[PDB]
Amino acid sequence: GSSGSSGEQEDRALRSFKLSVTVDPKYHPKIIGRKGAVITQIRLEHDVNIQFPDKDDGNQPQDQITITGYEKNTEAARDAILRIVGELEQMSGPSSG
């Protein structure tokens, strides 16, 4: 006998997916949360890893956010970081109406 029915998975590479979120370093310390739960929840929610740049570093971008994980999941999480910044910008702003 001889069989071999199995579709590729190319996971090794998928998991090695790195995403970059362009967002001012001002909201960076705002997204993380008070202690660091908010950001934690999201990560686990999508099962990804979100790491922000260190200002002290400098050479590296402080507005760029690195995120590892399944290209799909990562995107699902990167959407949040933005979904917020949007509301924040307005927060404490002149709201007409």
**How was this model experimentally determined?**
NMR
What's the start-to-end Cα distance of the chain, in Å? 76
Number of domains within the chain: 1
Q: Is 50:81 a contact under the CB 8 Å cutoff?
A: yes
Q: What is the CATH number of the domain that holds 49?
A: 3.30.1370.10
- In degrees and rounded to multiples of 5, residue 18 shows phi and psi of -115, 125
The H or E element spanning position 77 is: helix 71-90
Both tokens of 55, joined, read 């200002």
The H or E element spanning position 29 is: helix 28-31
The H or E element spanning position 68 is: strand 64-68
> SS3 for 59?
coil
Distance CA 91, CA 95 (A): 9
Domain that holds residue 26: 1-97
